[PDB]
Amino acid sequence: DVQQKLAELERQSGGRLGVALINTADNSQILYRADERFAMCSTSKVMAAAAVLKKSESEPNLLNQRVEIKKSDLVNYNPIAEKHVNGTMSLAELSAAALQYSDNVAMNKLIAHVGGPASVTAFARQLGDETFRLDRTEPTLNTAIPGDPRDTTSPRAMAQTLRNLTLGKALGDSQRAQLVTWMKGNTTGAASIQAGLPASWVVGDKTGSGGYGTTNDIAVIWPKDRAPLILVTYFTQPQPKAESRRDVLASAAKIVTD
Ligand SMILES: O=CN1C[C@H](NOS(=O)(=O)O)CC[C@H]1C(=O)NNC(=O)C1CNC1
16 A cells, blocks of 8 residues: 555656665565665765764774865855865864755765775775765766666665664764764755654754756654654656656655654
8 A cells, every 4th residue: 555655656756766664663664666776966975974983983083183175175065165265174064064954065075085985885885785886076976867877876775774874783872873963953854754754753864956856865763752764765857957856755755654
């Protein structure tokens, strides 16, 4: 029944929908095109920030290390970094900016610190994720051309990895809580997965959008007096200049939580 609802939502939208939900109360999953590749876009910022968190486990004060911001660093979307031109920002400030305001400059500094996009992929292979891959920097990683395997993952792999990072033992206890704290304090996700959930629920999410009307959101949801949920909703359209469809993500969220 839930599978037929998710199918009808896709058919009526004319796009391609990717859903993976993990319920920790019974360890069950709800999957739709869960092994198909979808372009992550901005969502990829969770894996870049976590890579820096894992690095900081063995290097002392890393989130304190400062990084120079120049005007030539700036690209299409940098709401926080553009306030720091010819100043510095710590790796904590950049992590918080990438995750909570979706600053592409912050993400690029996080990518460059660990060694580049292939070095973020290497961090994903360390955790047991063999589908994730990062190839380019922001914003070119958002091109989301159908067929292109660059900067993609599957809904199943991301859901699994998100659980390991935010609830499981993939990072240290302090590092885990920090990511949770960052994702919970996001400002960008009110119209996406959150919109199809009850208002009172605590949510930590990372949104994303790009070419071909690609509309994305990955989330860990903590309902009061319940066990938490992990949800990945990835959507993409056939037309190159298609507008976003966040409402499809909210609708998919509702179908799978009630
Ligand atoms: O996916 C993440 N981002 C960063 C930014 N924030 O996305 S958000 O949707 O999570 O708020 C805006 C959309 C998207 C982005 O950078 N814009 N899209 C592009 O690919 C631009 C580069 N020329 C088109």
